[PDB]
Amino acid sequence: MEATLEQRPFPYLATEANLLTQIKESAADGLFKSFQLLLGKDAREGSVRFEALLGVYTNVVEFVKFLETALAAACVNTEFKDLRRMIDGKIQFKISMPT
Amino acid sequence: AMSGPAAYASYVVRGANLVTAVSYGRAMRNFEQFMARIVDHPNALPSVE
Amino acid sequence: FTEYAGAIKTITSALQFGMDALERGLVDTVLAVKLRHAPPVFILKTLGD
Amino acid sequence: QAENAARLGRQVLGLLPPPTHRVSLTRGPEFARGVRDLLSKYAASTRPTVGSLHEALRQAPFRQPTYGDFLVYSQTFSPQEPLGTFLFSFKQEDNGSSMDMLLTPTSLFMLSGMEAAKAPQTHKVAGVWYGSGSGLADFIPNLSELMDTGEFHTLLTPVGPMVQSVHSTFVTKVTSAMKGVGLARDEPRAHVGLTLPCDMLVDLDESCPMREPAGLNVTIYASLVYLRVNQRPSMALTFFQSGKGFAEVVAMIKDHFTDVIRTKYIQLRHELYINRLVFGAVCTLGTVPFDSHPVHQSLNSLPVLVFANFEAACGPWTVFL
């Protein structure tokens, strides 16, 4: 990005030394780049104008625990530390049937 | 019956916005709030409340 | 500082994303266990009597 | 002023190759505590944080490429480039103390002299970086005879992508990259990828699907084809992007260049010169990781692809036909 000129009404500062000598020649043959002439009927501070940010609006993901869903009433939850160690689980039922 | 505001909300640019508004050509809604997060609490996560 | 502390916010929000995409894994697979063992009404109803 | 020198105490002692793992036996089993990067399964918690895993991120693999430093005439290397082009080191004879000749693929299109319709995009762009084709032909007077007997694919050594180029009026310095990911100079903490013009690249894997397996690897191949146009010998350089392995693509490149084989070899029913039988060569420009999207760009227009995470690994030239 090349830095450009702009006519925005800066709070300019004054220097003790002058500038004005040999400027009229230097507009015709370029001593320096980035210059723009201004005649006295239009040499002023321009009306300041802008655009704006009005907000940065961002979603927040509220996490939903499995234990605090009401789905978990259909399950029995046990914290089991080392589950990679287990091979197989097994539950045994014994049903007696009277006559 | 209902209840609400009677007047419009206010948004005028103060001196902190006006330096950016003249020079940089941009302004920003509630510059004092952006200062509370970028330079004052840079590791505050964006919460809801 | 605000590049550093703006980088520690990104990596947590990438990693809070890590855990909370796995808590959805519970609610997926538990519901996926139920549907494997869920026959419809018209099959099971007359077996109920 | 020594605070500036205290910075070099930090950065140089922080950036070193890791030293050799050597522990005396009288210390005991302390050496097992000195092995951290081989540990690859870090523990997690209910709410993990950076402070729980700042040790986990600290071990990183050891990656440092080997650069190339070339001193080039400012006429051959065009003074403006997109900083990621591919290169070639042409070599004939050490005549000077240190002068080197470098060829971008836009420049090698100008020494070729093929028709405009083979590459309809780069011909306008490569015609404005250079003259009519005699600005570069003055340095190699044998471009008629290097095409006949077919020695041109033996004189190119593929180098890789650019990194940095400081330009002066007569002499242009070129900093190239080999072995992998070149570090970007101007932007800190960035990585220079390899950029090809969209016109020169020819994709190989393209299906409706109407299934192919995935992998970690896809290898860019360079190609260079000897041909004849207007009864004058000229070359043609194309690129390939495929992960099919070397046993397939040699059969696949033959199907791409079917017409070029046929239109040449109509001539040799009349004259059969054994020097003319050599046709083309294929090098290996290094691997690309899988599923990286090549992103289209636009320059001046000129559309230019880009490959993030490119690594270079040069290979031989093998003569396919």
mmCIF file of N, CA, C and O in Angstrom, chain C:
data_model
loop_
_atom_site.group_PDB
_atom_site.id
_atom_site.type_symbol
_atom_site.label_atom_id
_atom_site.label_comp_id
_atom_site.label_asym_id
_atom_site.label_seq_id
_atom_site.Cartn_x
_atom_site.Cartn_y
_atom_site.Cartn_z
ATOM 1 N N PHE C 1 1.721 -7.063 23.815
ATOM 2 C CA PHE C 1 0.915 -7.668 24.871
ATOM 3 C C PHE C 1 -0.476 -8.024 24.367
ATOM 4 O O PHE C 1 -0.980 -9.122 24.623
ATOM 5 N N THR C 2 -1.106 -7.108 23.631
ATOM 6 C CA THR C 2 -2.438 -7.377 23.107
ATOM 7 C C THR C 2 -2.418 -8.284 21.887
ATOM 8 O O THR C 2 -3.485 -8.722 21.446
ATOM 9 N N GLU C 3 -1.245 -8.555 21.318
ATOM 10 C CA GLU C 3 -1.134 -9.634 20.348
ATOM 11 C C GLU C 3 -0.962 -10.973 21.051
ATOM 12 O O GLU C 3 -1.526 -11.983 20.618
ATOM 13 N N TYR C 4 -0.192 -10.984 22.140
ATOM 14 C CA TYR C 4 -0.024 -12.188 22.948
ATOM 15 C C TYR C 4 -1.333 -12.592 23.613
ATOM 16 O O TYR C 4 -1.804 -13.722 23.455
ATOM 17 N N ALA C 5 -1.933 -11.678 24.371
ATOM 18 C CA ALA C 5 -3.173 -12.001 25.062
ATOM 19 C C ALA C 5 -4.367 -12.094 24.125
ATOM 20 O O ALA C 5 -5.408 -12.616 24.532
ATOM 21 N N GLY C 6 -4.248 -11.609 22.894
ATOM 22 C CA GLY C 6 -5.238 -11.910 21.884
ATOM 23 C C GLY C 6 -4.995 -13.212 21.172
ATOM 24 O O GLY C 6 -5.808 -13.625 20.341
ATOM 25 N N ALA C 7 -3.877 -13.867 21.476
ATOM 26 C CA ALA C 7 -3.563 -15.185 20.940
ATOM 27 C C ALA C 7 -3.902 -16.284 21.939
ATOM 28 O O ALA C 7 -4.163 -17.424 21.549
ATOM 29 N N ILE C 8 -3.891 -15.961 23.235
ATOM 30 C CA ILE C 8 -4.280 -16.940 24.245
ATOM 31 C C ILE C 8 -5.798 -17.082 24.293
ATOM 32 O O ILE C 8 -6.323 -18.104 24.751
ATOM 33 N N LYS C 9 -6.530 -16.081 23.795
ATOM 34 C CA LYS C 9 -7.985 -16.183 23.725
ATOM 35 C C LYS C 9 -8.417 -17.102 22.594
ATOM 36 O O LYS C 9 -9.430 -17.801 22.698
ATOM 37 N N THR C 10 -7.673 -17.076 21.485
ATOM 38 C CA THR C 10 -8.017 -17.893 20.325
ATOM 39 C C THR C 10 -7.851 -19.370 20.631
ATOM 40 O O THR C 10 -8.721 -20.186 20.308
ATOM 41 N N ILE C 11 -6.755 -19.722 21.296
ATOM 42 C CA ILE C 11 -6.416 -21.123 21.486
ATOM 43 C C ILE C 11 -7.296 -21.759 22.562
ATOM 44 O O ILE C 11 -7.590 -22.958 22.504
ATOM 45 N N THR C 12 -7.781 -20.971 23.524
ATOM 46 C CA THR C 12 -8.781 -21.497 24.452
ATOM 47 C C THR C 12 -10.122 -21.694 23.758
ATOM 48 O O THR C 12 -10.804 -22.701 23.977
ATOM 49 N N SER C 13 -10.509 -20.748 22.896
ATOM 50 C CA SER C 13 -11.787 -20.860 22.198
ATOM 51 C C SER C 13 -11.729 -21.919 21.106
ATOM 52 O O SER C 13 -12.768 -22.351 20.594
ATOM 53 N N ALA C 14 -10.523 -22.331 20.718
ATOM 54 C CA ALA C 14 -10.354 -23.526 19.907
ATOM 55 C C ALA C 14 -10.395 -24.795 20.741
ATOM 56 O O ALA C 14 -10.609 -25.880 20.190
ATOM 57 N N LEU C 15 -10.188 -24.682 22.051
ATOM 58 C CA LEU C 15 -10.045 -25.866 22.887
ATOM 59 C C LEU C 15 -11.238 -26.045 23.817
ATOM 60 O O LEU C 15 -11.531 -27.168 24.238
ATOM 61 N N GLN C 16 -11.939 -24.958 24.149
ATOM 62 C CA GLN C 16 -13.286 -25.097 24.690
ATOM 63 C C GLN C 16 -14.209 -25.689 23.637
ATOM 64 O O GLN C 16 -15.143 -26.434 23.951
ATOM 65 N N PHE C 17 -13.955 -25.355 22.369
ATOM 66 C CA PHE C 17 -14.571 -26.044 21.244
ATOM 67 C C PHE C 17 -14.213 -27.521 21.206
ATOM 68 O O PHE C 17 -15.025 -28.329 20.747
ATOM 69 N N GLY C 18 -13.027 -27.889 21.676
ATOM 70 C CA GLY C 18 -12.616 -29.277 21.706
ATOM 71 C C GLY C 18 -13.414 -30.131 22.668
ATOM 72 O O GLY C 18 -13.842 -31.232 22.315
ATOM 73 N N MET C 19 -13.618 -29.637 23.890
ATOM 74 C CA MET C 19 -14.371 -30.403 24.876
ATOM 75 C C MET C 19 -15.863 -30.383 24.571
ATOM 76 O O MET C 19 -16.543 -31.408 24.688
ATOM 77 N N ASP C 20 -16.391 -29.230 24.169
ATOM 78 C CA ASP C 20 -17.831 -29.127 23.974
ATOM 79 C C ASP C 20 -18.301 -29.661 22.632
ATOM 80 O O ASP C 20 -19.510 -29.658 22.383
ATOM 81 N N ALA C 21 -17.400 -30.104 21.764
ATOM 82 C CA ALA C 21 -17.792 -30.941 20.642
ATOM 83 C C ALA C 21 -17.762 -32.412 21.004
ATOM 84 O O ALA C 21 -18.220 -33.245 20.216
ATOM 85 N N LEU C 22 -17.217 -32.741 22.173
ATOM 86 C CA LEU C 22 -17.214 -34.110 22.657
ATOM 87 C C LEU C 22 -18.376 -34.370 23.606
ATOM 88 O O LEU C 22 -18.813 -35.516 23.742
ATOM 89 N N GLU C 23 -18.896 -33.326 24.257
ATOM 90 C CA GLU C 23 -20.100 -33.498 25.062
ATOM 91 C C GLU C 23 -21.328 -33.688 24.187
ATOM 92 O O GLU C 23 -22.320 -34.275 24.629
ATOM 93 N N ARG C 24 -21.286 -33.198 22.950
ATOM 94 C CA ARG C 24 -22.320 -33.559 21.995
ATOM 95 C C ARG C 24 -22.204 -35.015 21.573
ATOM 96 O O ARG C 24 -23.206 -35.613 21.167
ATOM 97 N N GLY C 25 -21.005 -35.587 21.653
ATOM 98 C CA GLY C 25 -20.785 -36.989 21.368
ATOM 99 C C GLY C 25 -21.525 -37.913 22.311
ATOM 100 O O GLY C 25 -21.925 -39.009 21.914
ATOM 101 N N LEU C 26 -21.691 -37.496 23.566
ATOM 102 C CA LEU C 26 -22.494 -38.262 24.511
ATOM 103 C C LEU C 26 -23.952 -38.285 24.084
ATOM 104 O O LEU C 26 -24.540 -39.357 23.929
ATOM 105 N N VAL C 27 -24.528 -37.104 23.860
ATOM 106 C CA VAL C 27 -25.935 -36.971 23.520
ATOM 107 C C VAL C 27 -26.259 -37.571 22.152
ATOM 108 O O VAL C 27 -27.390 -38.009 21.920
ATOM 109 N N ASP C 28 -25.272 -37.674 21.264
ATOM 110 C CA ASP C 28 -25.447 -38.387 19.994
ATOM 111 C C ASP C 28 -25.520 -39.891 20.243
ATOM 112 O O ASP C 28 -26.503 -40.543 19.879
ATOM 113 N N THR C 29 -24.475 -40.446 20.861
ATOM 114 C CA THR C 29 -24.319 -41.897 20.909
ATOM 115 C C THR C 29 -25.304 -42.547 21.869
ATOM 116 O O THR C 29 -25.722 -43.688 21.650
ATOM 117 N N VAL C 30 -25.683 -41.845 22.940
ATOM 118 C CA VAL C 30 -26.688 -42.383 23.855
ATOM 119 C C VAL C 30 -28.044 -42.446 23.163
ATOM 120 O O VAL C 30 -28.772 -43.443 23.262
ATOM 121 N N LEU C 31 -28.376 -41.403 22.402
ATOM 122 C CA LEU C 31 -29.578 -41.446 21.577
ATOM 123 C C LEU C 31 -29.437 -42.444 20.435
ATOM 124 O O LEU C 31 -30.434 -43.027 19.993
ATOM 125 N N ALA C 32 -28.211 -42.683 19.964
ATOM 126 C CA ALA C 32 -27.998 -43.705 18.948
ATOM 127 C C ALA C 32 -28.064 -45.116 19.518
ATOM 128 O O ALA C 32 -28.352 -46.056 18.770
ATOM 129 N N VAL C 33 -27.800 -45.290 20.814
ATOM 130 C CA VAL C 33 -27.976 -46.598 21.443
ATOM 131 C C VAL C 33 -29.459 -46.930 21.573
ATOM 132 O O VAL C 33 -29.879 -48.065 21.311
ATOM 133 N N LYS C 34 -30.274 -45.933 21.939
ATOM 134 C CA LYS C 34 -31.708 -46.146 22.135
ATOM 135 C C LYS C 34 -32.408 -46.548 20.843
ATOM 136 O O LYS C 34 -33.266 -47.436 20.845
ATOM 137 N N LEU C 35 -32.033 -45.923 19.725
ATOM 138 C CA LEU C 35 -32.730 -46.164 18.468
ATOM 139 C C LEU C 35 -32.377 -47.518 17.866
ATOM 140 O O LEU C 35 -33.131 -48.039 17.038
ATOM 141 N N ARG C 36 -31.242 -48.099 18.254
ATOM 142 C CA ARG C 36 -30.946 -49.458 17.817
ATOM 143 C C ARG C 36 -31.818 -50.479 18.529
ATOM 144 O O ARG C 36 -32.059 -51.567 17.996
ATOM 145 N N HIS C 37 -32.291 -50.157 19.728
ATOM 146 C CA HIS C 37 -33.117 -51.062 20.510
ATOM 147 C C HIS C 37 -34.557 -50.584 20.630
ATOM 148 O O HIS C 37 -35.232 -50.941 21.599
ATOM 149 N N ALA C 38 -35.039 -49.779 19.680
ATOM 150 C CA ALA C 38 -36.381 -49.197 19.726
ATOM 151 C C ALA C 38 -37.211 -49.689 18.551
ATOM 152 O O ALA C 38 -37.188 -49.087 17.467
ATOM 153 N N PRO C 39 -37.962 -50.769 18.717
ATOM 154 C CA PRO C 39 -38.906 -51.177 17.687
ATOM 155 C C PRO C 39 -40.123 -50.272 17.695
ATOM 156 O O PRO C 39 -40.419 -49.638 18.718
ATOM 157 N N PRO C 40 -40.845 -50.173 16.582
ATOM 158 C CA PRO C 40 -41.995 -49.267 16.533
ATOM 159 C C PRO C 40 -43.184 -49.789 17.323
ATOM 160 O O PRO C 40 -43.143 -50.857 17.935
ATOM 161 N N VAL C 41 -44.252 -48.985 17.313
ATOM 162 C CA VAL C 41 -45.455 -49.299 18.086
ATOM 163 C C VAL C 41 -46.135 -50.542 17.536
ATOM 164 O O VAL C 41 -46.399 -51.499 18.274
ATOM 165 N N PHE C 42 -46.407 -50.547 16.224
ATOM 166 C CA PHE C 42 -47.247 -51.571 15.612
ATOM 167 C C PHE C 42 -46.637 -52.963 15.701
ATOM 168 O O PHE C 42 -47.374 -53.951 15.692
ATOM 169 N N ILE C 43 -45.315 -53.060 15.795
ATOM 170 C CA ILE C 43 -44.682 -54.342 16.063
ATOM 171 C C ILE C 43 -44.837 -54.724 17.529
ATOM 172 O O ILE C 43 -45.217 -55.850 17.862
ATOM 173 N N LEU C 44 -44.574 -53.784 18.430
ATOM 174 C CA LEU C 44 -44.466 -54.124 19.844
ATOM 175 C C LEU C 44 -45.808 -54.157 20.563
ATOM 176 O O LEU C 44 -45.902 -54.794 21.618
ATOM 177 N N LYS C 45 -46.842 -53.508 20.022
ATOM 178 C CA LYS C 45 -48.084 -53.329 20.770
ATOM 179 C C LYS C 45 -48.819 -54.647 20.978
ATOM 180 O O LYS C 45 -49.235 -54.967 22.098
ATOM 181 N N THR C 46 -48.975 -55.437 19.915
ATOM 182 C CA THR C 46 -49.695 -56.696 20.051
ATOM 183 C C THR C 46 -48.848 -57.745 20.759
ATOM 184 O O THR C 46 -49.383 -58.736 21.268
ATOM 185 N N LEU C 47 -47.527 -57.554 20.802
ATOM 186 C CA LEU C 47 -46.707 -58.368 21.691
ATOM 187 C C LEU C 47 -46.852 -57.942 23.142
ATOM 188 O O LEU C 47 -46.494 -58.712 24.041
ATOM 189 N N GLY C 48 -47.358 -56.733 23.390
ATOM 190 C CA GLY C 48 -47.557 -56.291 24.760
ATOM 191 C C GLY C 48 -48.684 -57.032 25.452
ATOM 192 O O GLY C 48 -48.602 -57.333 26.646
ATOM 193 N N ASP C 49 -49.749 -57.339 24.714
ATOM 194 C CA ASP C 49 -50.873 -58.075 25.276
ATOM 195 C C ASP C 49 -50.494 -59.536 25.485
ATOM 196 O O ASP C 49 -50.071 -60.211 24.540
#
